[PDB]
Design a protein around this ligand. Structure first.
Ligand code: COH
Length: 103
């Protein structure tokens, strides 16, 4: 995807609740450094719902694309209150940015 477009999407729709840099702070939601290839609910020092800790899947392109379309459908009980990025292209560019900015 397009990293520069995904970045703007992240700043507009995600930054209020998340940081991406290494050592970044937890805001409403968890810092996302190291997200890819890791199981759900594993950011150090963040208090996740039991649902986000137990989903049990590994975050990658496939699972993040599904999740970001409708967070609560994928993780029922989640405290991330956000409707989702409905357009596939916008979601793909956002995943491209996340992959680039979290490692
Ligand atoms: C109003 C707050 C808010 C918004 C707008 C938002 C917008 C977005 C966003 C924008 C499209 C992106 C890319 C993300 C991405 C994520 N968020 Co949020 N998140 C938010 C609050 C949270 C919270 C809170 C959690 C933890 C949920 C839980 O523990 O159930 C979270 C969890 C997540 C996770 C799972 C982390 C993990 O399993 O370690 C990802 C990925 N996210 N979030």
């Amino acid at each position: 995807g397009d990293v520069a477009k995904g970045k703007k999407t992240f700043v507009q729709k995600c930054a209020q609740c998340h940081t991406v840099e290494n050592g970044g702070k937890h805001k409403v939601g968890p810092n996302l450094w190291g997200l890819f290839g890791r199981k759900t609910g594993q950011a150090e020092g963040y208090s996740y719902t039991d649902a986000n800790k137990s989903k049990g899947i590994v975050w990658n392109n496939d699972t993040l694309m599904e999740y970001l379309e409708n967070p609560k459908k994928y993780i029922p009980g989640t405290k991330m209150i956000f409707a989702g990025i409905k357009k596939k292209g916008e979601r793909q560019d956002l995943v491209a940015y996340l992959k680039s900015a979290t490692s």
